[PDB]
Amino acid sequence: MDDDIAALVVDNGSGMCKAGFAGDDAPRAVFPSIVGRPRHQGVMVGMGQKDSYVGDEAQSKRGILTLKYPIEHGIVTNWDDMEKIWHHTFYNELRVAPEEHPVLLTEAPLNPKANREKMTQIMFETFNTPAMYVAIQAVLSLYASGRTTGIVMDSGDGVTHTVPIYEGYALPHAILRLDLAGRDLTDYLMKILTERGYSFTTTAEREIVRDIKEKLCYVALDFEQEMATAASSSSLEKSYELPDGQVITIGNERFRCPEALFQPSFLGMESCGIHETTFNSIMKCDVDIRKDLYANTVLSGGTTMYPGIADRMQKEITALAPSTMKIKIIAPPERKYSVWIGGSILASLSTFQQMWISKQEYDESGPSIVHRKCF
Amino acid sequence: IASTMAKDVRQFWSNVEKVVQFKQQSRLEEKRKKALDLHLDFIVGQTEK
Incomplete structure (x- = not known):
């Protein structure tokens, strides 16, 4: 691979999809994750009848289109619409060829293995990407916040999660989900x-x-x-x-x-509430790391953009947590884009170049290589 | 795998510290210039008396 080819980051959000190039400070494209289809044939005579619309193009035509959400509670439920959204992100939003740039994808915690295998198959067979990688949204949010250890309360548009992270380890036994x-x-x-x-x-x-x-x-x-x-x-x-x-x-x-x-x-x-959810998630972890988890509580997601949410979370976790623990809520101003920011960061590191799943590895091991390379 | 990735991204925080070194240098300059220049001017004005 040429060291001058920047990798692509695509944040698969339930409500909004964010895409851009690795190294950039902000995503170049942010559009709704929706796919619209005409309700009746003949309504678009003269406007370039398309079999489907994506993003703002479908959003502006909601009056005459039937919109569907391929991502429900952070899980992909329609793969055709997701492929359409990816084709859009690649060709209309970013205006680049996916077979010329690595693609880093984000997934919600506890994503079914079948979904990961299907994403890998789509990326290696449909778009012919040279390589790719799958990372957890909360892990990227933490890597964007300024820490490697802590707990991230990611609340998007479809689902909210409390992912406790120690040295970048999203602890499955302690992850809690709230619909x-x-x-x-x-x-x-x-x-x-x-x-x-x-x-x-x-x-x-x-x-x-x-x-x-x-x-x-x-x-x-x-x-x-x-x-x-x-x-x-x-x-x-x-x-x-x-x-x-x-x-x-x-x-x-x-x-x-x-x-x-x-x-x-x-x-x-x-x-339970988001504060009680975070408290219980921290409690399911080892006592040796609860101090760091409390001291590195990070907020992410669009739903976390409400003014004063950080102060309320601080108050609640201080009232619930032991008096000996120091509670600190971290709410970056751009926390709505922390996922994509961490993705770009991880993709821009040279040491991460060995973590990409190459086309050869996929052809040799198949989609299951995601379970051996992406954790 | 995840420990390797964590140690790899730990370099980004050493880089953030290298950036904060820029602010440290800015403060060092802003303070050293002030202090040394003021003291030089003062002692020169006191000796010329």
Whole structure:
């Protein structure tokens, strides 16, 4: 391999796909991970009828396209749409040939072996990539945060995970999964807004509510005190202008929505909050490393972008953890891209050049080589 | 495999320290210039009296 060929990093997110070149400070492309198909034949006469659309092209045509999500809770459920998304990322977004650059892919923790083998087969047979590698999202997030040991609370758009890492070791016995992410939060926001008198039923109204969530919602340090303040004062209300010019008022729903992350009971889910989840994950590890896990608690994912979430996590983990442990929450400003940042970092290291799965290794061992090279 | 990768990425933090060395050098310069130049000017102005 020529030392001048930069490797490609592709963050496979449930809600947003991020792609770029190794060494760059930020991903060159960030688009939704969706695939749209025309609802009726003949609706696109003259607009270059395509059998399918991907990314923003399908997002802008949601009114006339049936959108599907090939990634559900961080697991690939439709491989044809995933191949379409990869072809898009390679040819339209990055505008490069995948057979000329190594491709580093990200996967959620505890990814089924069949999915890894299928990704390897797709990359080596469909795109003819010279080499590739698969890394865990939380591991890349930690490697981007500034540490090799610690616990990462990665909360994306489809699923949230607490991956305890010691010297880069995502401990499978201590990894906990929670089916609560930005999607369920957007659904709950729609629900509570319908309770307030603002009914959102269509998929475009769902995107409007998602934008409202990303713009106005925040994590309160004290839920009861914040509710009391909202009930006794309107200083916590904020106005939002709808696409049709109508201005609506968002009240306590700003912090009631993200509160589900700490109290899933609001969603009817019998699961522990993200703080309790992280505490239990740290407790499943050896006592010798719990100190470092507490001192290196990192936040990642788009769902972790709520203002004040870091302070709430600090408070909760300090109240739950022993008094002798020093709790430190790490929330980088660009934590939404920590996965891709760590991927690019790992791909830009010379010592990592020996970790790529070459086409020869794949042809000799098959897709199973991922289980021998990717951990 | 994962210990090898961890030790390989441990070099990135030595590189971050090499970067922080830039800030250390900046501070060293900003302080040494100030102190030495001020002391030189002061002692020269005191001897010329």
